[PDB]
Structures are given as structure tokens and as C-alpha cells.
């Protein structure tokens, strides 16, 4: 399902590829 990323408001078709992007805000493993 389509997402946004919830820290920068950045939406996608891919909920996947949001999570990675998401991730992004929050830090690396
Ligand atoms: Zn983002």
C-alpha cells in the first residue's frame, strides 16, 4: 500500500521502498 514517510511528508507508490526511505530519518542498523 502506498505510504508517505512520516517524517518528511515524501509518499510512495511502494511500501517497501517508503520503509527504506523512512529508515533514512531514523538511522542506520
Ligand atoms: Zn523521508
Do not use: D, N
Request: hydrophobic content about 30%.
Amino acid at each position: 500500500k502506498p505510504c508517505q514517510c512520516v517524517m518528511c511528508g515524501k509518499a510512495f507508490t511502494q511500501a517497501s521502498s517508503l520503509i527504506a526511505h523512512v529508515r533514512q530519518h531514523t538511522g542506520e542498523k
